[PDB]
């Protein structure tokens, strides 16, 4: 069983892409930290095992999970019907939606995806933001592995906008006063922890930890920890 494999090796293998503050990011000490890293530590601790974070490209997470290189994905991942075809998700643990970020020193203030037609828009490959902008034939989409590359591209004027999730948009804009979020929230997404569909033992265990975190007040402590910059 899944729990048995974890306990046999002595550590939980968690996949994520650490370019997504405040969920998983590289801090001033060069350490991977964040809200999701803390969720990962709670799950591992409650299993009686150590934690191993496996950092990788975002679009590699699902295939890493299906190919059994990781036990679980905790990486700011939106629950979607398409992804539910191939993995299972925990109870939702956060709400977000896509927003559009542009340079402040420009007249351009897009409010919808249709406002991006005729523009060049940077996205992280494989995300819900990529999926949505990709629907609009007149958007010139530039896809990146890391949001740090997408913001560099935006800041230097090579792209007109970046489309990404609300909370991480706000985290990036807080550090970049040359940027602004021009749109409201364009989707209604929830984050989930992804596990293989056959690993219902692990899934149930993760749901129990989530429910306990909320009941105990520790979830609100974690929110305060990561959303009070
Ligand atoms: N750690 C990350 N880069 N996460 C990107 C998540 C973006 C979006 N919520 C999605 O599931 O597509």
Q: Are residues 104 and 171 in the same domain?
A: yes
Q: Which is the closest atom of ligand 1 to the Cα of 129?
A: 12
Same domain as 150, residue 120: yes
Shared domain for 86 and 194, answered yes or no, is yes
- Asked whether the beta carbons of 160 and 120 are under 8 A apart, the reply is yes
Pair (88, 195) in one structural domain: yes
Measure 78 CA to ligand 1 centroid, in angstroms.
Answer: 7
Atom number in ligand 1 closest to CA 16: 1
**Residue 177: which domain range?**
98-181
Closest Cα partner for 99 from 75, 77, 132? 132
Best of 15, 39, 40, 78 for a ligand 1 pocket test (most atoms within 8 Å of beta carbon):
78
Strands 194-195 and 140-144: unpaired
Helices of type H across the chain: 2-9, 35-47, 61-66, 81-84, 128-133, 147-155, 166-174, 200-216, 218-226
Residue position matching structure tokens 């994905």: 73
What are the residues whose beta carbons fall under 8 Å from the beta carbon of 209, sequence distance 6 or more? 39, 42, 43, 46
Of the candidates 225, 226, 208, the residue with the CA atom closest to the CA atom of residue 42:
208
Q: Could you tell me the distance, in angstroms and rounded to a whole number, from the CA of residue 166 to the centre of ligand 1?
A: 11
Q: Domain containing 143 — which CATH number?
A: 3.40.190.10
Residues 64 and 130 in one domain: no
| 16 and 86 housed in the same domain | yes
Q: Are residues 41 and 72 in the same domain?
A: yes
Specify whether 200 is located in the same domain as 89.
Answer: yes
Angle formed at CA 5 by CA 18 and CA 208, multiple of 5 degrees = 70
Helical H segments across 59-140, by residue range: 61-66, 81-84, 128-133
Nearest protein CA to atom 7 of ligand 1, as residue: 127
* Residue 193, C-beta contacts closer than 8 angstroms, at least 6 positions apart: 39, 72, 73, 74, 77, 89, 90, 93, 206, 210
Number of domains composing the chain: 2
- Method by which the coordinates were obtained: X-ray
Atom of ligand 1 nearest to the CA of 36: 1
Q: What is the DSSP string of 182-209?
A: -S-----EEE--EE-TT-HHHHHHHHHH
What 3-state class would DSSP assign to 107?
A: coil
Q: Are residues 109 and 148 in the same domain?
A: yes
Nearest to 7 by CA among 53, 54, 48: 48
**What is the resolution in angstroms?**
1.6
Whether residues 90 and 106 fall in one domain: no
Query: Strands 120-124 and 50-55, how do they pair?
Result: unpaired
For residue 73, give the nearest of 85, 84, 94, 58 by alpha carbon.
Answer: 58
Number of H helices, E strands in the chain: 9, 14
């Amino acid at each position: 069983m899944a729990i048995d494999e974890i306990k046999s090796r002595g550590y939980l293998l968690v996949g994520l892409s650490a370019d997504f503050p405040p969920f998983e990011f590289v801090d001033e000490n060069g350490n991977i930290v964040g809200f999701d890293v803390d969720l990962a530590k709670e799950i591992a601790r409650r299993l009686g095992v150590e934690l191993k974070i496996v950092d990788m490209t975002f679009d590699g997470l699902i295939p890493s999970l299906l190919t059994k290189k990781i036990d679980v994905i905790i990486s700011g991942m939106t629950i979607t019907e398409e992804r539910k075809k191939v993995v299972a998700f925990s109870d939702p643990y956060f709400d977000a939606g896509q927003v559009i970020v542009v340079r402040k020193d420009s007249d351009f203030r897009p409010k919808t995806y249709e406002d991006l037609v005729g523009k060049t828009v940077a996205v992280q490959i494989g995300t819900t933001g990529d999926i949505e902008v990709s629907k609009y034939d007149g958007i010139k989409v530039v896809r990146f592995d890391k949001f740090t590359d997408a913001f560099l591209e935006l800041k230097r004027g090579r792209a007109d906008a970046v489309v990404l999730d609300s909370a991480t948009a706000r985290a990036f804009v807080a550090k970049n006063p040359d940027l602004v979020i021009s749109s409201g929230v364009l989707s209604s997404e929830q984050y989930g922890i992804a596990v293989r569909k056959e690993d219902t033992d692990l899934l149930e265990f993760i749901n129990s930890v989530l429910r306990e975190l909320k009941k105990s007040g520790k979830y609100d402590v974690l929110i305060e920890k990561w959303f009070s910059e």
